[PDB]
């Protein structure tokens, strides 16, 4: 369930970030910012919400949604999204949809670590977390 993601979570690990960075249209410069970062993501339970903060030396972001409900997203890379989150299983699946284009991130826990799968068409990221 949700509960299981409530944490806080500190970046060790990214596979493939750069390319998916690409893809999505974020310049050289901002690339290489991106792939050193290390971001904290905390997230909780508030009500019928669910947030997501996500704390770093780049830029910091909130969302806070309803599962299953359309919301306006303003990303880090200041993309203006119609974003859906839903739990699917155990997993917890975010749309994001901007400008006739799509992306999804897939959150898992597994062995105790937070894995964040990344799709952009045919371009695959993943980042792992662990509960700090």
Same mark, same amino acid.
């Given at each position: 369930?949700?509960?299981?993601?409530?944490?806080?979570?500190?970046?060790?690990?990214? *596979?493939?970030?750069?390319?998916?960075?690409?893809?999505?249209?974020?310049?050289?410069?901002?690339? *290489? &910012?991106?792939? &050193?970062?290390?971001?904290? +993501? $905390? #997230? !909780? *339970?508030?009500?019928?919400? %669910?947030? $997501?903060?996500?704390? !770093?030396?780049?830029?910091?972001?909130? #969302? !806070?949604? *309803?599962?299953?409900?359309?919301?306006?997203?303003?990303?880090?890379?200041?993309?203006?999204?119609?974003? +859906?989150?839903?739990?699917?299983?155990?997993?917890? %699946?975010?749309?994001?949809?901007? @400008?006739?284009?799509?992306?999804?991130?897939?959150?898992?826990?597994?062995?105790?670590?937070? &894995?964040?799968?990344?799709?952009?068409? @045919? %371009?695959?990221? %993943?980042?792992?977390?662990?509960?700090?």
């Amino acid at each position: 369930m949700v509960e299981a993601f409530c944490a806080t979570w500190k970046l060790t690990n990214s *596979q493939n970030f750069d390319e998916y960075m690409k893809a999505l249209g974020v310049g050289f410069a901002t690339r *290489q &910012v991106g792939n &050193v970062t290390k971001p904290t +993501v $905390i #997230i !909780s *339970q508030e009500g019928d919400k %669910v947030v $997501i903060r996500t704390l !770093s030396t780049f830029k910091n972001t909130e #969302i !806070s949604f *309803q599962l299953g409900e359309e919301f306006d997203e303003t990303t880090a890379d200041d993309r203006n999204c119609k974003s +859906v989150v839903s739990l699917d299983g155990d997993k917890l %699946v975010h749309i994001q949809k901007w @400008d006739g284009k799509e992306t999804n991130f897939v959150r898992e826990i597994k062995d105790g670590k937070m &894995v964040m799968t990344l799709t952009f068409g @045919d %371009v695959v990221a %993943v980042r792992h977390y662990e509960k700090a």
